[PDB]
C-alpha cells in the first residue's frame, strides 16, 4: 500500500468539501438578502 498518496487524497477531498460548503452558505445568505431587498425595491412582476 501507500500512505502519503491516500493521506493527501483524504485531505484534498476534505478541502473541496470545505470550499464548496462555504460557497453554498455565502450563496444562501446573499439569496435571502436579495429576496428581502427586492421585496422592498419592487414587489410587482418585472
Amino acid at each position: 500500500m501507500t500512505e502519503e498518496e491516500q493521506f493527501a487524497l483524504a485531505l484534498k477531498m476534505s478541502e473541496q468539501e470545505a470550499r464548496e460548503v462555504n460557497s453554498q452558505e455565502e450563496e444562501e445568505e446573499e439569496l435571502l438578502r436579495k429576496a428581502i431587498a427586492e421585496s422592498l425595491n419592487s414587489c410587482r412582476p418585472s
Binding site: 444562501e28 428581502i36 421585496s39 422592498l40 414587489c43 412582476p45
Partner: protein, 76 residues
C-alpha cells in the same frame, strides 16, 4: 380573499385565504399544492420574514398581495 406567492423559479401560485389565517396555514396550503415541507419554507413580504404564530392581518396583508417564497434543501 386571494393572495399570490412567487417562487425562486419564477412560478406564481394563487392561494385562497382569510386575513385571520396564520402563516402556518399559508405554509400548509403551499405544502398541499407543491409538496414543500413547512420546515423548508420561508415567506417574505414587504422585506419582512413571516412567522408561524402570526396572521395575514398582523402584517396588513390584503387581497391580490404578492409574497416571496424562499427555499433550498435540508430540514434540520
Amino acid at each position: 380573499m386571494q393572495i399570490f406567492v412567487k417562487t425562486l423559479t419564477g412560478k406564481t401560485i394563487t392561494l385562497e385565504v382569510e386575513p385571520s389565517d396564520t402563516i402556518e396555514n399559508v405554509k400548509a396550503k403551499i405544502q398541499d399544492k407543491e409538496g414543500i415541507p413547512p420546515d423548508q419554507q420561508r415567506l417574505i413580504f414587504a422585506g419582512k420574514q413571516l412567522e408561524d404564530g402570526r396572521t395575514l392581518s398582523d402584517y396588513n396583508i390584503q387581497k391580490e398581495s404578492t409574497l416571496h417564497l424562499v427555499l433550498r434543501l435540508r430540514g434540520g
